[PDB]
Swiss-Prot record, chain B:
Effect of residue 477 to Q: In EIG11; associated with disease susceptibility; the mutant channel has accelerated deactivation rates compared to wild-type, but normal activation and peak current; has accelerated ATP-dependent common gating
Post-translational modification: Phosphorylated. Activated by dephosphorylation.
Native organism: Homo sapiens
Primary residence: membrane
Name of protein: Chloride channel protein 2
Catalyzed reactions: chloride(in) = chloride(out); thiocyanate(in) = thiocyanate(out); bromide(in) = bromide(out); nitrate(in) = nitrate(out)
Record annotation: effect of changing residue 147 to Q: In EJM8; associated with disease susceptibility; the mutant channel has accelerated deactivation rates compared to wild-type, but normal activation and peak current
GO cellular component, one term: perikaryon
Localization in the cell: Cell membrane; Basolateral cell membrane; Cell projection, Dendritic spine membrane; Cell projection, Axon
């Protein structure tokens, strides 16, 4: 049951990933062809390069808003809530699936600096849930909510891995971000299905002849014998620490911008009146600023995210390219070398500018991710550091009568992984970059930088997903009993339905306490609403009524039904939930936190969560 | 607090690992020098090659028995119970630490086909606990038990990673074996400390000039551009499936041998009388069977585990060595090519013999691991498959007008990873082998073989560590209430200490419920042992009697009317909570979350006995 479900999930995920990659590649090449074919005049080229991304962003935003507004956003915090016990059923629908897929496809094909990790993991979970209902028609065993949650958790890992074609890093990323306690059984299913999905995706890529064989997406060609020297270790460490700041700073600005979007009343009014104008305006601004013959000469704006990341991982030293540039074809790296600006100046401009472009683009009401822009900007930072170090040591480092030339690509990988970890607070970023590049020779520098960046970022700022979810010994002193109300309705065993209907019209609660006797008061079991509906539906069979012997007003029928309320109730056929939640009134808040973090139950033992959460919010912010 | 603790744990672990590796290398080179220096006569060479491993094994077994018999065994299943909530305090001692370290050193220097991961992770747990106890003198915040368990779990990953110098693979392996529910916070601490463990170990290795730079332990030199072809995918998959059998079979035979070692009364009596003879006898047998000029010519017995594993990872094709063997120095692989036996025959003999050799050596009452023999034998199996495939395709596979030669080293890596995963039921083994080899070019075939082997092994047999711990719709019908005795002693709030001492002398339980009245039975508050100690200490103060102006037991009885206070010391009045009607699935998950033993008193012993009774019928 489980294994075939994972296999099918992986197969459909590989198909979806391949078709989305093909669509975004087609959109990108269409954009490049339109830009190049209108080179006769700068004005027409600017007009096309502006209108195209604007058109795609407006179309995606409008389609997502009309079809399913819940598709807006990354969705990773949403599944964090899902796996913490808060079941938002509205997010897992076919309409939201189509809206999110089309919106993410258009956003990624418009050339916007956005990521796919969030919407794609959301689609992973949604597809797993849809396959769960599809298999439910062939058997009720899938109706279990615990197994559905397990499959959703596995599908998160499957989607994150299929994003990078990295089954290990994807599953580790999902474990870090979507949960705090993870079962090794769920790890097994998630990694298995992610492996199958990556296999099928690579086979499809080979079949389409996009890649010659099953290989890495971001191939590097660093030296394996001597990839790095010991004297390179501390600077690499610095690359981490600064990246941590670059992480802690980033999560700051984004959280501010949305607040500026939310707190300002005039901006809110403009959004409520002209919701499609803001994405159009920001896309206009970014397209104008990244115009290749304009400011794009200082940013290499003619490159999309993929080729930019590939170029940043180049193993050659750009600073020394000026002497051996006669016996090779024109490589892509020449786009980073304008005749008027040095490599270092271009890298600094790209960093300082793409930083705030990504910060603003992450706030757009479209399905998009943030891991890709952070990865690209960190790769640029690492490339800058590596080029600076190579400039400081033109002939490399001397060790044991040998001279080893410094490779800026290793520094770029280090910086990308470190800044991704700093922004996200996840350890798998090293695993993801390792599986993307295909070389683990730089394992120690990347790892040290990632650890340092994650540590300093966690010391400074919480994670970006936590920011989204928050925007979208003295503990023993406080007691819970001080806010408990003694007024609770009780139902006698031999009472009539009059008191029951009076309580139903008086109390809007979802549950009632059916006690055995007022003295012992041993509660035997809760009653579900679906149980009552099923009993009512089955009771109206003519056989039982016969054996247990038109413009009319409904009041007469209601009176007859009231007079016919002397029949017994049965609890044999349908299921009964045997597990109330458990706490003690004197439980320490640490154990409370651990238990509620373990599985995420909204209810405890009647006490409600609303006022307790109000008190907690009033005890932490002040 | 935590971070510096991890840093110190990593530093000491790296130092211990480096000194252990140096000692093992010194013992191995001493054995090789002794064997080579007595080549004048085969009899004396055989005598030395027999006595030396026997001497080290007997010394290790005797020292472990005398100092701390608890150090016997791998230590992983015992650490798993510690993380499941069963606190066996006897294992985490200085004496067990010293005994286990010296036994590991002697056993791995004797040339025995054994591994270190289990005993080494046990060292990790013990040193983390000892560091906690040492620095607890500087602060009380560490006598909390939960944080002690967290650092034990972190040290598990620390030790497993430092074994392979693989920060990611070690932590993931530890998560697979030692726990079923793991916190990402514990992952962070364990991975941090393991990373600095590997860093310091590599720095020390570079300083000692053992390695030129910080690099992989088992360097491979496979082609990075095109490492494998798609037509190689199904055979690689087969390498997994058979390895799964090779896993499920292995865990079988070991569990049988110990059972035969346990059930047989004569062997057991010999063990009580001559416990040092059995390791000596088995060491004599294995040394005789791996004698290099004897049967070792068909098994390459001149090579220990490390160089054997390095040779099995060679990128050259052995079958074709016979034509281009004139312009290179004599490589280690020549040890696998006797003039009388082909490569395939030698590999098959090595497989068939080393399999049962490792199976028998895993049962020895010395601290040893099984991952290294399984890894070596799986590498041999993969090398055999790769050589056979290269023989079937002498010029490689043709793809896109190109011809690519088959590299048996990738097959050896795939087989080793698959069989290690099949034996251990751990997915992480791919990451460990990847960080050891330093190349991830064969990544997809490795994971396919590992997952297939793990699936078939789990379908067939439980894990080796589970075997060790077990040797050392109608489900809903059975209920717990059917085995409960309704008679439980109760203590009234208005009673004297006479009834309390009577209950303590009658009931051996650690805690009792002090209720107000037998009717309401409202438990107001528990009394800790420290509370009783404080009351006893304050009871003997002469100042209270003086200022208010045998026989010891009578005086205490006369002084039983003093007040009690609940202000100074801490009290935890909230024991763990469960429902009697909890279904078995979530019951199993909880008894594996933090893991409990007791619940609400109802005892689990009779239910466990009933479960154990479901096997004979």
């Amino acid at each position: 049951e489980d294994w075939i479900f994972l296999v099918l999930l992986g197969l459909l995920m590989a198909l979806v990933s391949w078709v989305m990659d093909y669509a975004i590649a087609a959109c990108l090449q269409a954009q490049q062809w339109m830009s190049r074919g209108l080179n006769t005049s700068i004005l027409l080229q600017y007009l096309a390069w502006v209108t195209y991304p604007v058109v795609l962003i407006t179309f995606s935003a409008g389609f997502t808003q009309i079809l399913a507004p819940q598709a807006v956003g990354s969705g990773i915090p949403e599944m964090k809530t899902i796996l913490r016990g808060v079941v938002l059923k509205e997010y897992l629908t076919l309409k939201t699936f189509i809206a999110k897929v089309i919106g993410l496809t258009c956003a990624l094909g418009s050339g916007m600096p956005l990521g796919k990790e969030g919407p794609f993991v959301h689609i992973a979970s949604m597809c797993a849930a849809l396959l769960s209902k599809f298999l439910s028609l062939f058997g009720g065993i899938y109706e279990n909510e615990s197994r559905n949650t397990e499959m959703l958790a596995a599908a998160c890992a499957v989607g994150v891995g299929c994003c990078f074609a990295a089954p290990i890093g994807g599953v580790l990323f999902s474990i870090e971000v979507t949960s705090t306690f993870f079962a090794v059984r769920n790890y097994w299913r998630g990694f298995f299905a992610a492996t199958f999905s990556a296999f099928i995706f690579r086979v499809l890529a080979v079949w389409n002849r996009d890649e010659e064989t099953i290989t890495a997406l971001f191939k590097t060609r660093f030296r394996l014998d001597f990839p790095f020297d010991l004297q390179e270790l501390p600077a690499f460490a610095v690359i981490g620490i600064a990246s941590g700041f670059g992480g802690a700073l980033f999560v700051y600005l984004n959280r501010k911008i949305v607040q500026v979007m939310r707190k300002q009343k005039t901006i809110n009014r403009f959004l409520m009146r002209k919701r499609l104008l803001f994405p159009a305006l920001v896309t206009l601004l970014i397209s104008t600023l990244t115009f290749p013959p304009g400011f794009g000469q200082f940013m290499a704006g003619q490159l999309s995210q993929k080729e930019t990341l590939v170029t940043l991982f180049d193993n050659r030293t750009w600073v020394r390219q000026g002497l051996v540039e006669e016996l090779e074809p024109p490589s892509t790296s020449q786009a980073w070398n304008p005749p008027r600006a040095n490599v270092f100046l271009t890298l600094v401009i790209f960093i300082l500018m793409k930083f705030w472009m990504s910060a603003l683009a992450t706030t757009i009401p479209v399905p998009c991710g943030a891991f890709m822009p952070v990865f690209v900007i960190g790769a640029a930072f690492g490339r800058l550091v590596g080029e600076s170090m190579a400039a400081w040591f033109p002939d490399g480092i001397h060790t044991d009568s040998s001279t080893y030339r410094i490779v800026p690509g290793g520094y770029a990988v280090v910086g990308a992984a470190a800044l991704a970890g700093a922004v996200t607070h996840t350890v798998s970023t090293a695993v993801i970059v390792f599986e993307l590049t295909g070389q683990i020779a730089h394992i120690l520098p990347v790892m040290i930088a990632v650890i340092l960046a994650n540590a300093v970022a966690q010391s400074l700022q919480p994670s970006l997903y936590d920011s989204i979810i928050r925007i979208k010994h003295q503990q023993y002193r406080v007691r819970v009993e001080d806010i408990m109300v003694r007024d609770v309705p009780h139902v006698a065993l031999s009472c009539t339905f009059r008191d029951l209907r009076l309580a139903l019209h008086r109390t809007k609660g979802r549950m009632l306490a059916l006690v055995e006797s007022p003295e012992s008061m041993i509660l035997l079991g809760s009653i579900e609403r679906s149980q009552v509906v099923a009993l009512l539906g089955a009771q109206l069979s003519p056989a039982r009524r016969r054996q247990h012997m038109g413009e009319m007003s409904p009041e007469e029928i209601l009176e007859w039904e009231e007079q016919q309320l002397d029949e017994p109730v049965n609890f044999s056929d349908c299921k009964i939930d045997p597990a109330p939640f458990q706490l003690v009134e004197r439980t320490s808040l640490h154990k409370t936190h651990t238990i509620f973090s373990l599985l995420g139950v909204d209810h405890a033992y009647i006490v409600t969560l609303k006022e307790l959460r109000k008190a907690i919010e009033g005890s932490v912010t002040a």
